[PDB]
Amino acid sequence: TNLVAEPFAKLEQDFGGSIGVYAMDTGSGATVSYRAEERFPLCSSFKGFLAAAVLARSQQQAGLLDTPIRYGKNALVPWSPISEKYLTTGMTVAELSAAAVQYSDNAAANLLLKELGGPAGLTAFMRSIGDTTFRLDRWELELNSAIPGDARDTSSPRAVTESLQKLTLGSALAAPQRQQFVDWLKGNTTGNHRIRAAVPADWAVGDKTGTCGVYGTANDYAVVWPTGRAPIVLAVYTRAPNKDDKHSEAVIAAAARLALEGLG
């Protein structure tokens, strides 16, 4: 029997779907795991890893992050609030990366994907840091279909957490790039009702959300700095069997609370 898992099972049953959780205390090595190795759609949460891949490239290409990109209207797609705002201005690669992470800006994400060689290029980056689970197959907006049983554009909560740890706390990026990634995540604006709602108010959090919406599919991953202690890395993903099943932010927050409670 798995007593630790029981509250998660009750939560997903009330939600009407499946919840996947993995949390790591980087100080002690303690973990909390629930469906941690099952695949869930990434949805917009891929944009955090996208920004990390761009940062990695920026290490070998002088001034890449500072480079202005003068895109046109043809680059814009729905939910591109920052890209639309700066259309008449242009944006640097750093500004596009921050917009993709902090506002889930779609045009910015597609522009950066282009720079990396598309979804296959981002997947190759993830393989290069040892993530064999992550796959991105499509661009915005198509990658958000979240069809049950479709492995396209998916990862697992465990692989997401492991990769997030390597990029934000480990050595996958050079230190100034690691710090930029953390700072972008810390400035996210879309996650106030997810992992952030589960964390004591005095603890710093960097996160990236995803919300396919269809098939009850939404998620969040985060690095959490409890004031005195080593950081925690965690991922919470959901899905449900029917197209019109609603996602729930409250369920993601509740799962995150259980994960923090269950950690040593």
Ligand SMILES: *C(=O)/C=C/N[C@@H](C(=O)O)[C@](C)(C(=O)OCC(N)=O)[SH](O)O
């Ligand atoms: C990331 O989680 C974004 C999810 N939904 C976005 C998107 O697809 O980028 C939209 C809000 C959306 O409508 O979902 C896609 C769709 N075809 O329905 S758009 O408006 O940016």
